[PDB]
Write a protein that binds this ligand. Structure first.
Ligand code: NA
Length: 136
């Protein structure tokens, strides 16, 4: 069960993720700072999820069911069509395809550990960012 309100405890390689997607330095710096203490709300009902991630300047709300395509944005803010699957019991993986144009291959994963941590990974081609959260 991923449901709850989550707070960040670790972040690794976020600014570089943005950098390889081409994000300019002014915007990268604003984004990393804005996301340093995010609010993440998840409501899980079986395979149905609601995930709201808020930084100081942005809020994103996704609604999806595992196995059903949905629209979101890439981490750099480009609209995409996404599809989540269960890789294993505690771990979901998301493939993203841009709605318009082409770009680096992006994806994300979310997994719950036995100690109750939520691990988010985000990838752009060969660059990986890892963020870890715990429940409030
Ligand atoms: Na790369």
């Amino acid at each position: 069960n991923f449901s709850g309100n989550w707070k960040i405890i670790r972040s690794e390689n976020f600014e570089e993720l943005l950098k390889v997607l081409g994000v300019n330095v002014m915007l990268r710096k604003i984004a990393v700072a804005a996301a340093s203490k995010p609010a993440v709300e998840i409501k899980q009902e079986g395979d149905t999820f609601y995930i709201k991630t808020s930084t100081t300047v942005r809020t994103t709300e996704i609604n999806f069911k595992v196995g059903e395509e949905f629209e979101e944005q890439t981490v750099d803010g480009r609209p995409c069509k996404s599809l989540v699957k269960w890789e294993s019991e505690n771990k979901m993986v998301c493939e993203q395809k841009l709605l318009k144009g082409e770009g680096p291959k992006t994806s994300w994963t979310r997994e719950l550990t036995n100690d109750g941590e939520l691990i988010l990974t985000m990838t752009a081609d060969d660059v990986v960012c890892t963020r870890v959260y715990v429940r409030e």
